[PDB]
Amino acid sequence: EHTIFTQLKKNIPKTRYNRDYMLSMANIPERIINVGVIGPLHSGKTSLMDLLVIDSHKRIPDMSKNVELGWKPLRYLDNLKQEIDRGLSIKLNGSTLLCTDLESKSRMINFLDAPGHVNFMDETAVALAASDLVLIVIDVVEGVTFVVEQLIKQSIKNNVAMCFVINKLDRLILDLKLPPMDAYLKLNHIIANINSFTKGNVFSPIDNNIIFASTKLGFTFTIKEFVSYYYAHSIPSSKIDDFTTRLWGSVYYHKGNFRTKPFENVEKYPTFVEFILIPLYKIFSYALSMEKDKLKNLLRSNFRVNLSQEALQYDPQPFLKHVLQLIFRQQTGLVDAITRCYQPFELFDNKTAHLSIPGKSTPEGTLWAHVLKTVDYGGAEWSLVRIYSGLLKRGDTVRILDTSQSESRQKRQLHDISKTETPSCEVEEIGLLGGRYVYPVHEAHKGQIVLIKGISSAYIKSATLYSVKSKEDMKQLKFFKPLDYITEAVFKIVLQPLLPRELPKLLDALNKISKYYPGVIIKVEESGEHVILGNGELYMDCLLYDLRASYAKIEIKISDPLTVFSESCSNESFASIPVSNSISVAAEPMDSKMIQDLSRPRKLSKILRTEYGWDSLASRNVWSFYNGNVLINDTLPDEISPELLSKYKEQIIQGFYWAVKEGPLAEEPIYGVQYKLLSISVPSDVNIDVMKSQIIPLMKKACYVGLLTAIPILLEPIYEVDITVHAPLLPIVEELMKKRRGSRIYKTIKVAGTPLLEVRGQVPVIESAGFETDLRLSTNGLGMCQLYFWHKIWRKVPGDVLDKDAFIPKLKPAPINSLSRDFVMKTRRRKGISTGGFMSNDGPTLEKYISAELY
Amino acid sequence: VSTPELKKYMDKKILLNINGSRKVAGILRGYDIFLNVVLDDAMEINNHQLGLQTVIRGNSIISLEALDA
Amino acid sequence: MVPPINCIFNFLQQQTPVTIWLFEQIGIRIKGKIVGFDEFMNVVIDEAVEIPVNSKGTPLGKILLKGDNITLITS
Amino acid sequence: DSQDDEYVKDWLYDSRPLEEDSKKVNGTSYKKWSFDLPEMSNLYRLSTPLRDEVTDKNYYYLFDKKSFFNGKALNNAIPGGPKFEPLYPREEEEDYNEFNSIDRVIFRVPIRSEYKVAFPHLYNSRPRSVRIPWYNNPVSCIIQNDEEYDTPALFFDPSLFAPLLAEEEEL
Amino acid sequence: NGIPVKLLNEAQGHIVSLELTTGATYRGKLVESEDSMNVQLRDVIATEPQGAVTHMDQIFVRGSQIKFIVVPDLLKNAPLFK
RNA sequence: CAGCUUUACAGAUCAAUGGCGGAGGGAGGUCAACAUCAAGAACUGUGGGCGCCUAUAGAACUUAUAACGAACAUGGUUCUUGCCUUUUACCAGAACCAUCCGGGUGUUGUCUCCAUAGAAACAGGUAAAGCUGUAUUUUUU
Ligand SMILES: Nc1nc2c(ncn2[C@@H]2O[C@H](COP(=O)(O)OP(=O)(O)OP(=O)(O)O)[C@@H](O)[C@H]2O)c(=O)[nH]1
Incomplete structure (x- = not known):
């Protein structure tokens, strides 16, 4: 019992603060900030986390000499071979640390290091879900890209407190070599952009929200922090807050001990530029350039930090790094800023409501905890669980739900408004994060995040867990929803294993992948063709590696990568036709705005409809949409108001659900439709169940018919396409874009203070296929593209489906109109609907398609 | 230097335990960095109200225990 | 929010029946009309009246009661 | 001089x-x-x-030693890069199965050699002994041979007690 | 700045005990503390100087009138002092 | 401008106790001989020196990765190309051993420059070096 624990403790890096204290703190909530460090690709959030880790610990095991010197990063939370070999932090491989503040109020923080790269929004999403605060991190230079804006938007929704980290100041000092004034201007611009992206809150260096950082060198400061270190000496305590306030913005300070008049005389350089940025610049120059002795003297005088004898014999980048670490101390400022940001706990309730419906909690009688993500921290599986309320002890006998079954549960509860516990679990070991170890603990508590070893057998992906002791408690309980994995998947990898003897193994691995990588729809289709919707290419590759090395360990084939296509109409329907073995339906494509709204109480609904698409009152009355796909169902005949046969809709819509799930043409889901009932020819003899069953087929058929009528189409998706190219290489990029079929430049934005042209675009996900690689080869190591699908924007595959003339070449890519059909046919073939090397598509029923639509 | 965080107690009735083993009641209307209290009036603890609104000095306050949760 | 200074100012503007309590002195109270204002709680209060508390009235002129020994105000 | x-x-x-x-x-x-x-x-x-040597680490995208190794062990090439014997036996015999037919897949992307090494585990099937390549960030820089220093040369322009070193230095 | 103040701040969350000038001990979760020991506490019992005890919800106390504060013995360990 | 330690000291008594060790050099050289080599060193063992350093040796796990060496040539067996046929000699790719060419680390010696006490401090004084420092509601008017 104890011996094992001791052993575990031993196999671990000894922390500078006592872990006992941290544990004690964790027993109390409000002393636990859960922080998602998040940002764009290569923000240097992982690096930042590394710095924090370093600060925490005395000596790390695999911290090499080079890394110590400050050459390579030691991305302490990169962990698994995949990530260190690849360059990208890939999974949410976080850490827990006590951190003192300016005014040393310790607080046990549960950092979770997101992945930047856009095809891992899954992990980012998870982090967001977990973490009540989020350190957004930004490259100075790359600026507030669209990705960052998106993140901000989808952190307001969650919701969360948004500290920012303007990371990579070194880049503007040394790479861009901006003057100090210019740098300041750039920073201001960035701040403005951030504010714009935000709705409610204003962010600035004052009020502790911006955290200026350069993790390469490894300094973070906030302005308050700076003041504490280096401007208590020279000012009386009472006027320190005021000074801090002055520091940011359009403010100047002339020779006057101690005023500080806003504006102004002769030589400019503002307060921020004079008292911060300029100082930093000087430090940099001196660190690199100056006679070392003089620098040392300066640092004795102006900072009271001593360049050691061993440190003096360093090389520049290392020396500079050392200097900056000496200056701005083990990063307390950041922690302070974080603390300031997190309200706290006004937000928290709201966040929890968002996660799992509004209501009221129950502290003593039960515990509940969001099982957020399965992981593979210490080889074996754990569930990264956040305990929201109660305290979850080791060995405890526990309830659970995969949030596939959450909505259903809620519905059941509502209906209710015996004691059946559907699954269960025995909590083997509970631990903390992180990076390169799992500190084990007997008790998990309300507030804090943990890894839990007993959980995994029951759940897949999102999950809740609970431990009630009543009926009342059960009633009170709610269930976290599945996490809006902001990106969504779009990218098919169709698997065969090479030796189909070893399909079981693959299946086992596949389940693991599903669990472990949570942004992956694994469809196992009827033919034997397994299918994997990745977010994108890199993510997919990573997943493959994980499967094809660790979890499966088998030789495994792969297809040229495809998409999902979804069904939609262009024009409206024309003639309803009820089928027998008796109901008829017809669909119009809904307004684009409405669709967009959907992508992002009856009277209320009606009002909303009116606001959106100018729907009448009758239309409002009729509505009943479904699936979050989306398609919209409308009960809009005449007799329906008299009829109670059209009433009992709850039964009727089952067919609709099915239809939406798998459309006619693709056998692949419908999208962007307003379905409308026209007639429901129900006979006199009921047999209610039988009737219901009939409806369940018939409705689908009706829907299909409607789709056919309305001039249907496959909808391909479009990747929104960030490209951060070098200015004079934009023509090349344009050419590249032109070269392929779907491709469009929606704007070319100038990233201020850089040579970068942030050119947002759109590209369809079958046209994507390695596009990043193409971009990077062509552009000669410039223009780090990204592709992503935050929006859920689809488009017309350009042409008319249902044409046997179609195309010429089997082997080649087909022309655009032709392609409109070709994809559909191929999809059908894949599904196993058409039978043969050559075939066609047509819709029954009936009467020979009404005599070929009356010729 | 810092403001007394009594924004939770704003517009709620409070038992102001005051100097010399005395008491005051009343709904909280305002305060400052010295912990003076401005409150819409109530009784001195059987019982008898004086005033429409009242102001208690900072020094005088032992405690301000919340009557409402 | 209505700060204490603001309240005091308002009272001054009004000229209303103010009843002051003494710090660490139960038995006595003051009753008058606020005339002055200071950075501290100190004020001048013309037409004041000393009161023995109910466990009547007593004669008293114009007075400034010092801010340190104030307790209650009402106006 | x-x-x-x-x-x-x-x-x-x-x-x-x-x-x-x-x-x-x-x-x-x-x-x-x-x-x-x-x-x-x-x-x-x-x-x-x-x-x-142009040391924008990104310049060497698909010209890192790892990348070359990958290319070698995929029997794949880059117009500028080298080519070898195939490292494993070139024994295809696909047999156009239910999966990987002509009428099942959609040959939309050309799937050049360049891609196969850049994403070893996706585009190439059966990657035996193929190392995981990098994926880095983009460079902003200025390297010059002029008299003046520390200025914006070719960037895009934005929208709009002494501090602790104060004439110890000029910046 | 004062290290006792820091300690007090740290003790936030924890169940502190707290006597005043009057000699009226309290014991409760420390909600908030300031530089001047202006303590707030939750779920707090209140002993009279004579003997009798009274439960109460969210007490505020002004540090001026506070005498001494007992903090839990865990805070002895870390991480304020060094 | 106050205090404490740390050196130079004056002349102490002189304990006293500390510290200083009862004294053993610091450099380098295309000087050697000898081991031992990715760094790791976790965790254990067993030493000195106090829930912990410093040495050792033992595997674990690390990633090696890019670089004991920002270096790269050559052998051999086997397997596979290919000259082809045969000998060398090779083409061009694998696997496992080996070969040089270089490399550090400490152990020691040896050879040319730089040094240099045989003790010092207590009680404070002198000189310098290092850290801590204004009454009107919450601390001490
Ligand atoms: N010049 C400069 N380079 C930096 C700075 N911070 C990080 N980098 C470098 O740019 C890269 C970014 O750091 P990473 O830690 O890899 O970024 P990350 O947070 O892991 O990004 P994800 O893997 O997407 O989360 C690394 O190669 C760093 O060495 C900086 O402040 N200045």
């Missing part, structure tokens, strides 16, 4: 070479060398004619 390369010209061209008798080396055994900045800078400048 005495102006530009002042710190080297007295020693640069000598047997050992020089900087041989000083604090700037271990000694005559000549195993460990140390330098100040200006001399180093001068040396670098002198070199530039010879060793202009």
